[PDB]
Amino acid sequence: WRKLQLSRAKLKASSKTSALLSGFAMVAMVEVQMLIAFAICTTLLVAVAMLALMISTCILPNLHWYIETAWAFSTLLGLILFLLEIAILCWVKFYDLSPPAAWSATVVLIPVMIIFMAFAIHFYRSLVSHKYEVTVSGIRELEMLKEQME
């Protein structure tokens, strides 16, 4: 039961989060009109969303942890992209007459981008340790019962 809920929380969370961001990016992209990177970041980011969306289409009809990875990865990947795209936008909006102000965007981006990925590693690190922590405590308890059994 806990398995389905985990996925469902992932199902709707991704769809709504992904669709609104892609639409906002598309609307802002047509308004203003590094140079080449802009076209790629936008198109690719959208795809990350599309797949997660379909995941929602196929999940209900139907290993559980495997598909789980697809969502956490795709969704988390996008977050980096959204902030990634905005950094470029400032470069696009200012890059013309405002280049001076534009630099502050990409430069300030590095401090936050690192913390975001770095924090993800720390949270994940503590988690793995627990997987091993439970494995040790679990076998120890089984020996206590097996020893008194004799």
Place this chain on the structure above:
Amino acid sequence: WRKLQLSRAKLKASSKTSALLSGFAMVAMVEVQMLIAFAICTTLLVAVAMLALMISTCILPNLHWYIETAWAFSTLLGLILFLLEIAILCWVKFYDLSPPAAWSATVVLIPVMIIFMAFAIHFYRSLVSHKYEVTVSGIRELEMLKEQME
């Protein structure tokens, strides 16, 4: 009971997903203003949505698997279109002064587009294997009872 839920999940999911994307595409289309393809992709994509919408209008009043196909097909079909349309937009925004950057959009599109359709086949393949697999598991037991029966 499970039959109605499957459709309902399809009923609302399609409507909301379809209406927002079509509106965003229409808004961005009027802002910027391959050449001919742009007009077609937009208009057609909308239709895919419209039908699915009506499906919601007729389903509640009222074979179940048949209609089911219409939704999975129409919805999945649209996803390819949305990402399909954005690729063209970059070409519409850059195609003028930025043609160089525009190419990265359609090119990068191929890698993701293939994986999307390809993954769909794999998921479907595993599903079919089970449908038949079960058919074998069910009858097998029946023969067991039959032999012991007599």
Place this chain on the structure above:
Amino acid sequence: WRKLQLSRAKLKASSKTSALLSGFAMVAMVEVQMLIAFAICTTLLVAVAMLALMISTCILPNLHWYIETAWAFSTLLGLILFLLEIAILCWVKFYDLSPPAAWSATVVLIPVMIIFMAFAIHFYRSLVSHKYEVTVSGIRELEMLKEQME
């Protein structure tokens, strides 16, 4: 009980579907600025929605099948209009510098428009047949009881 639910499903479904589409059409209409038809399609489409909206206002306070027709008709009518309006938009956005690409919009429109209305007839046809089908099967059963009754 089933009667109220059928209407309620119609009550909210129409309001949300109608209001968002009219607003999107109004926003895109002011951005770009067959010629005369454009003004009519937009204004009329909105009205179809407005009435359905009020239907929601008057229904709760308060023959059931009669009002039911108004919703199914108005809502379905709009779907044709939305796709109808977009076809014109392509003709409006392109009609200036892109007239060549514009034709593909209206032409491609015919294939989908027909299928939409045509499919509606088929679904409705099967429904009517069943209504009669049940009417015959029902009376036949009552005669079986009435005959053995003697």
Place this chain on the structure above:
Amino acid sequence: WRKLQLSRAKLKASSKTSALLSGFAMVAMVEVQMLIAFAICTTLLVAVAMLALMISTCILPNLHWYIETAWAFSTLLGLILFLLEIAILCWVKFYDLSPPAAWSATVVLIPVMIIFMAFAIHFYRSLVSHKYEVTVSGIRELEMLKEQME
């Protein structure tokens, strides 16, 4: 109990319906920039909404039918205004280069506007008749109990 629900359905329905329409009208108004009427219709329509909004703020804390009238009136009044404003918009967006097409907007407006108000009268008429229809049937039943009482 039925009394509170009727109002609540009115409470949220008005707020959401009113706020989104006013914002859309304000956004489109600044984009394009009968002549004088435009400014009035927009500002006034908003007010109709604002009051209804506050009605929601004061209702929860705290004759019931009296306040009820304020909502039905304000909300219904707005619907006429929204379609009213769009008619003017076409006159504003086309009034420049497209004056010819503009006329089709106001003219086509008359057919729907009449039906909207006319239909409201019919629905209300049937309602009043029932109120009296029940008053007659009710007293009749009481006399049946009073007569057999003797």
Place this chain on the structure above:
Amino acid sequence: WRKLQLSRAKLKASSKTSALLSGFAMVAMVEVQMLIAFAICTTLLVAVAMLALMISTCILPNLHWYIETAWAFSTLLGLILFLLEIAILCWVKFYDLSPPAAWSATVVLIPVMIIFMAFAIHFYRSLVSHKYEVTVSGIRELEMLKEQME
């Protein structure tokens, strides 16, 4: 229990109502570009919302009537501002070439603005009377029990 609900109804109601209006005002403000007043009204109105938002952040963690005042005041205060800002917008959109039409906006504003604040006083007035009305009826009943007690 009734205390928490009253606040919660206030918690979400304010956040959604405030955030959407501020964003719409900001979007329309950048599109057009009394003169000085415009900048102030917009910035200040936003603040009124921000505080109410935080109120939602601090309320859940944790006198009840005191905080209650902050919401009713801030929210109601904003309503006047929104209609206030729109009156200025008409003056901003028309103030250039359309000054004549602009006047109708601010002038027509006075009639509705007064009724809004005036009606608020009346509703509040009747409320204060009841508070006292209950205080009198309550003590009277307690004496009835205390008298027969002897």
Place this chain on the structure above:
Amino acid sequence: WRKLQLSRAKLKASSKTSALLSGFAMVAMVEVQMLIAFAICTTLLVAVAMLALMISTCILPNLHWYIETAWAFSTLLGLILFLLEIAILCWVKFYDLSPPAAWSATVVLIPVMIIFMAFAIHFYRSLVSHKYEVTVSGIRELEMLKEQME
């Protein structure tokens, strides 16, 4: 149980509040096009949101008070930023031809900004006192039981 709810209320509240504000800021930023500060405020504000978003991604899978701080801090921090950004916008829209009207924005900003942060301290101050207030009342009750125990 109360622990999970507190976080959940924080989970969705932050995501919706953060995503809409960042999109509105991005849309308005591209429309108009202190000078350098504008680029930074926008980019940084977004980051504050992104992290909070991920917090929602990692919380469900899995000390409680620690993570709690991250949300209250990030969310509250943003509020100051949103109003902060708008102050700059007025300076961006007016800063060109309207510099005079622009000053009223930043100046008026100080009065509200202080109250916002100042009020936060007061609410927090009363809270801390209670933490100590309970600590004293609690130990006192335990002694009452321990004393009569002898």
